[PDB]
Amino acid sequence: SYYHHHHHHDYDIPGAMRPSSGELWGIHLMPPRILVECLLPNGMIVTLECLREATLITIKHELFKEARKYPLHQLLQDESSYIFVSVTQEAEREEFFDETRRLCDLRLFQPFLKVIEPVGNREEKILNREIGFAIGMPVCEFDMVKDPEVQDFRRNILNVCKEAVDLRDLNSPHSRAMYVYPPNVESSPELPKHIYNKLDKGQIIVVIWVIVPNNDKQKYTLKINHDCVPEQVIAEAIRKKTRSMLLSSEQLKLCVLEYQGKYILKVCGCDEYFLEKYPLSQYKYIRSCIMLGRMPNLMLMAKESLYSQLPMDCFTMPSYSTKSLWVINSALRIKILCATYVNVNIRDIDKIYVRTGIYHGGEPLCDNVNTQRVPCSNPRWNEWLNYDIYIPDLPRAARLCLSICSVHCPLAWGNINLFDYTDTLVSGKMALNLWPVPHGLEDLLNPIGVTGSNPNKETPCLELEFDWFSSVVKFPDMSVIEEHANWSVSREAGFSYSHAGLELRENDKEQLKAISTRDPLSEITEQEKDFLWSHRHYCVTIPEILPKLLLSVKWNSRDEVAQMYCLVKDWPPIKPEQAMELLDCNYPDPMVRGFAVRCLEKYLTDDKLSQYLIQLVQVLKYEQYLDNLLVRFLLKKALTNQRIGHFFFWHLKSEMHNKTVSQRFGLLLESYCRACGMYLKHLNRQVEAMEKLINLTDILKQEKKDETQKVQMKFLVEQMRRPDFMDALQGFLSPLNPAHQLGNLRLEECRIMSSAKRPLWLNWENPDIMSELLFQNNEIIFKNGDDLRQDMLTLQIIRIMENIWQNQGLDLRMLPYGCLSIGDCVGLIEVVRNSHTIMQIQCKGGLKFNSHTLHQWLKDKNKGEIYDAAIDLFTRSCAGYCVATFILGIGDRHNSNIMVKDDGQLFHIDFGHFLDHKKKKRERVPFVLTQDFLIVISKGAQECTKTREFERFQEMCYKAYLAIRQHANLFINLFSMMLGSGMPELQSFDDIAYIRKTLALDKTEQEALEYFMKQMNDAHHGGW
Amino acid sequence: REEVNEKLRDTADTLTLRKNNKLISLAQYDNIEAVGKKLHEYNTQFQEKSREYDRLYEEYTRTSQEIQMKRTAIEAFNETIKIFEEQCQTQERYSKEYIEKFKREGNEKEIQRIMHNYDKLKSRISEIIDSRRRLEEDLKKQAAEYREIDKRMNSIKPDLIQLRKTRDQYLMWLTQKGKLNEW
């Protein structure tokens, strides 16, 4: 009667409710006592018992005592004459020079150690282990790479390394300290008005601290102008220290002059310094204190004790240092031969063929197939395919895309560049190993997918013959493309009158600027393309139209493409925000991307770079070759500035697991680590810390599952106290922010959370001199299971919406906490102290849960006139978080993913799928302000719909939403650049199209405003 | 612009013509209600299949990595063995020099202990090779299940898109005339 008695026979009673191998092959963490086969020079195998944690000095010394009890001891030298060696898990044979290292940290395969006399006697040069540890793959694995492009990248890219090292020691020690400790500084020295008003007539109280014995410290409260520089602030604090009943006025002036330049300003509690003449306000720390109603606490640090701290980078140069295409008078043809390794079931599948096409992002000719020959087993075609386009019409960035399909459905895919890194048109036979069908891609062929054969051997290997033409066919030089443009110009001037479908006009002159404004994802029509392409000379008037123009150009007509190359040549530089579109997958031409990197060199500030650095590293995936202008740009900026370098390293080191980029990023990381100076040692200490934490949580998750929290937690604390964990997890820099140092582990504040990912709550001592002034404890979460990079990105997108709103005079407060993905579903999350899930607030207030409990809880923290401003904080944050949330379309918000702070700020966490991923299998509103919230907005009131507080709040929502709608070009493009990462929520442009509807860009701003309210009104049921 | 791509998506070669969408030969230029249930029935079969497609794509890239792990482990074993092979040769150098250097003073005492070492060393090499050998046959049975993962993805993928397509067409039909959330 429940089930109409329908059985399920299939159902049996006994997914519901990785991994990186550990310290030894096949086991996560070596046993506390292990036996180690020691191969001696004399041929004797002597097995020693060792402690997991024992150093190689400890081991060697003990070995050479035990070696006396064995035969042939007289053959052996002193212990000091030898170094250890063994086969590691990456499968190379490391020579273990640093004998302070311990047995568990060696990444050995099997537990044996061979003894030898050290060869390659320049031992200096075999601290490439350092470089390989940081990168996570050995440098000898690049050495034996056959491909010339790689080897030519490796040697060529040192141009950059050298040039950037030379800027570092241009004013040493000042430039060196400016590299290592660069000034963390806002975009403009111009101030927002809501910030200014918090100044009582352009003035900050500041506190300059000093140390003199060392134990005792001394405040000096200056009240100075916000726009004054650090050198001024430093003088003022010296005046105050040294004024006395024994120094005349003039005596003081002569005491400041000797003193004024022996000091610099440090932030109390972290390694930030004020080394550059900027307004104090233009440093982020100051501008942070003003907003939070805090008193900047600086420190006078003498420069000799700062340059005493600094190193010497000492960069060493490594050991590793026709026919014009337009002559070829034929149409393109490519021979499909045979796939070898196709996994096809004969029982469902009819027939299989190789679909093909040439591409430029979008298509340049009739995409074809071949005949449905030898389907399923035995699969083999022998056809030249014939493509309607001439060999000279092929543009520099042309690419063959193919796929083996079913009947309609893809099985595999792979893409090749039709020219090589040296412009040579592809001839011969190629063996293309294929990539597998992704999630969101249902379409046949996949041209957004990466160029290159799969390094993975056991995959569909489709081979093919390319056409030969009596020579290496090379793409024409720029001088020759120029001349041909200059001819296409003078030629077209003489063409005669009656002519279809190609001075000016006033009606038209505005309609181009009409097009210029439309977002990337507003598709342009053939008429418009023609219309643009004909006025292309007037289009330089509006350099912002360029993306529309480039997409309008016919890339299959070399006459056009030579003309367009020549416009670009001296096109006027444009804004980074818009130029960034020119590095996404739709603009693959090198002259184009060249022009975009030339905009960044002029315009993009080291500040704005690091904001968009994620997007720029992703956009490397869409370059055709390894050596290209963007790579050299970023490589330079990273070696110019160690804050960028840090995140530049990690964003690469994150993706190294991913075989689409392991080569390219691997090679790039090598260059970085070879040039970045002493930061390589700092990165290796982070890299070593993160590994332990991975191996530790990897055990908690496999085997130690099914043991009470208590049991795991005792096993954790047992592990963390081991000397190697102590070594590895204590004196280092937080990767979320290298400014913050991490000292001793407070293991009693350190625990495993409730979650089934077994995320670690970790807590370090902030070992700064003035820790007290900023925070005595730095705590951050390490999370093994989840994929951080959706969150990482949504967090970024928020940070930018904030900066947009605030630099445009309106103060909604977002709290984009730190999130760093350091690997394949591994990462770090910043802990916001003094914050609780609404659901804790409801549990801890629950009488043996009333809608007021939140509001009650909040009053109970914020009493007096404090309360009034603390509601303003909640009202301001909650508005911003409404609009952002709506615009992005993040996961449904609820009581255990919403968080409020003691001071009354609210913010979201664990955002989940960002562009409305789950729901699309609509225009949802994910932040539904329940009664709980509306009560808090309306200090006492019932009927919260009706108050002014809600009208106020509504106004904040409307002003924010339109503010983002004017910078939507950016938000589209930021997401467009993120297509590179295989985030399922961003597989294709139509995924990004959600952000159009929700921002309502096809409508007019007034309609948009109403749509937002319409959307807000039905979700809430009344008010707007 | 948003919907016009999700209906032109997966079809053949402002008029939104699909050759990528060429916006403008142009070289010269009845139950009502019961079809509503079918939506839910197919919208459950489609999302039923999704996870079965998802679970396998993980297992695929697991086994892809699990296999690639196993290969390098062999590359390592082989290198490990080579050092043990080198070592047993390294002992046959200086052991057989020291047999005939004296061969007098504690001949039977010493050569037994030198011979013992050589034996342990060989028997070690014996264990590693069988350790390797065992990995390699486990590698093929992995590469087996691997071949089977793609096979079953490439049976489901056609059925998934057709299921998807009919689900849209039904969903179009209902909107033509005139709730859908629960279905």
Ligand SMILES: O=C(O)CCc1ccc(O)cc1
């Ligand atoms: O030059 C610097 O080092 C400061 C950063 C900076 C870079 C480019 C620019 O145009 C202005 C400023």
